[PDB]
């Protein structure tokens, strides 16, 4: 298994160190939100974590008060044997205006609609276990939680980091050799599908287990339906 | 050729199809596109529904993978690109941006082809129209076929953001002061109502509505932002007004008084500078909460240019005079610049700000290499030790100068930066030569480049 070796070495911060050729393609920018009115006068800070596929980190996506309020709503809703040790909950916009505000903020940043997106998933991770590499877009040959929604496959993932983790807990992409480190109040965003609608198999990823601390994270998965005008197709691939 | 009531168009039959149909919606698609696959059954369902209703509106599709030149002729860069053709006009086809469902398509088409103004039989229909929107317009014509009523309907079809109404009922006229034919704009702010004055033409009506459809002074929030920036007003004025400021109401009233002179030309906006939600906007202008209250003016015509008053006396007269001087081209653009540090040149790496950038970077005797960075940028933080080591290497060089500028707090006319870090070299010359550095961000790469005279 030179798979577990690669996964664990990436979790330890080892592995691929970007070549100056790859690194010279990464930049920071003020994100205009693809000319979203709000963000024309108040742009967010965006930093490139990877050039291809494009993986970006957005700063100051949530304040400590918004984070704590989301944690308070989630905590009671959090909590075949389960080896991976974590808890999860799904939040509705009616739970608190904070939930509705973050959903709208994510729509402004990505340029994608939250009207077809999944509920705000809040997950807390306990030290240990193991989270296996997978693709967030589920296979179309499967009878999962996507055909019943009729919203299509998950076109993008918006991962918010809601806690400072003492050590561990990176999000690792084995096929890229990329590890994305937790940073409270920041969010990491990448597309799971190409312009064509077919799955981007470069985006295979897994969560490193938490070594010391408690990782709080909130995920927002956007679906392809409703994005036809927001993210049009591009010729051939 | 017709597939499920959708006309199959090609370069050979396209001109014939546009001439044959007064109202034609055309989808430019590609068979591999996920969005086009999902749209196809809804597009056919909408076409079948329009055919079952006996509508003159027809739906058509063009495969852009086979009809490339035809798709290129209409600037099709994405799929699906949907364009509506009215009266066979190929010069200005309207792009369809609304929902992907068959009902959204049908509703979009009927809203554009339908009555420019809704017929109001009574005062209850007129009140329901005025309550349905923040701004609503009603035309009062005894004869709906009169030439003034036709010019009103032409103005009504040119405006999509305001719901229009038309009435011939004398009760509706009598509602408040209308004795004869005329037009009235209703609004949920300020005076609540504006009556049209002058000759009833399409041009006079649109100019009157454009001038009176916007409130005097608007509070900047995430809810008001889309209305402000979705609008065609490309000149805006912002007042950063802390809620903790003495005589908040009086200073806000001075801004309102000035705004009356520029209705429809410059949009007046105020924002609470004490609130944390408004921090990104303060940071975008390079402003601190202690520098508030402050006023800034912006032009959104492609290159967002900022302007600031020469006097920070925030009276109704000074705000009016600043706006007039801007409109007269008498005010120069404001480029942000920090205070020049006393020790800017003491270090091997020279510190630049907007104020000294020009005389340092464009020194005819010096080969200047400048790092344009952001303090919060991870990649800039990683470059900083390499840049310091480069500065330390060339510190005693006769003509090479290593420099850096915080581009989040400094704007310069010569160089515009939109990524961080951006590295530009200014060779020793008076013809303002600039060479962009696109190589590896290593001390080795920088030496090769400097030693080659900016060639490598």
Numbering used by the authors:
A (entry chain A): 284 to 362, 376 to 533
B (entry chain C): 21 to 476
Show sentences the authors wrote:
Collagen prolyl 4-hydroxylases (C-P4H) are α2β2 tetramers, which catalyze the prolyl 4-hydroxylation of procollagen, allowing for the formation of the stable triple-helical collagen structure in the endoplasmic reticulum. The C-P4H α-subunit provides the N-terminal dimerization domain, the middle peptide-substrate-binding (PSB) domain, and the C-terminal catalytic (CAT) domain, whereas the β-subunit is identical to the enzyme protein disulfide isomerase (PDI). C-P4Hs are Fe(II) and 2-oxoglutarate-dependent dioxygenases, which use molecular oxygen to hydroxylate proline residues that are present at the Y position of the -X-Y-Gly- repeats of the procollagen chain. Studies have shown that the β/PDI subunit is required for providing the soluble and catalytically competent conformation of the α-subunit, but it is not understood how it is assembled with the α-subunit, how it is involved in intersubunit disulfide bridges, and what its role is in the procollagen hydroxylation reaction mechanism of the mature C-P4H α2β2 tetramer.
Here, we report on the characterization of two truncated human C-P4H-II variants in which the α-subunit is lacking either the N-terminal dimerization domain (C-P4H-II-Δ140) or the dimerization domain and the PSB domain (C-P4H-II-Δ281). The asymmetric unit consists of two C-P4H-II-Δ281 complexes, which are formed by the CAT domain of the α subunit, complexed with the complete β/PDI subunit. The N-terminal region of the α-subunit of the C-P4H-II-Δ281 complex, residues 284–328, which was previously proposed to be part of the linker region between the PSB and CAT domains, is actually an integral part of the CAT domain. This unique N-terminal extension of the CAT domain, not seen in any other P4H family member, forms two short α-helices (α12 and α13) followed by an extra β-strand (β1, including Cys311) of the major sheet of the DSBH-fold and another short α-helix (α14, including Ile324), before continuing into the secondary structure elements known from the other P4H structures. The structure of the C-P4H-II-Δ281 complex shows that in the CAT domain there is an intrasubunit disulfide bridge between two conserved cysteines, Cys294 (of the N-terminal extension of the CAT domain, in the α12-helix) and Cys504, located in β-strand βVII of the DSBH-fold. The assembly of the CAT-PDI heterodimer complex is stabilized by interactions of the unique N-terminal and C-terminal extensions of the CAT domain with the a’, b’, and a domains of PDI, whereas there are no interactions between the CAT domain and the b domain. The CAT-PDI protein–protein interfaces near Cys311 and Cys529 (of the CAT domain) include disulfide bridges with Cys397 and Cys53 (of PDI), respectively, which are the proximal cysteines of the CGHC motifs of the a’ and a domains. The third important interface between the CAT domain and the β/PDI subunit concerns the hydrophobic interactions of the Ile324 side chain of the CAT domain with the hydrophobic pocket of the PDI b’ domain.
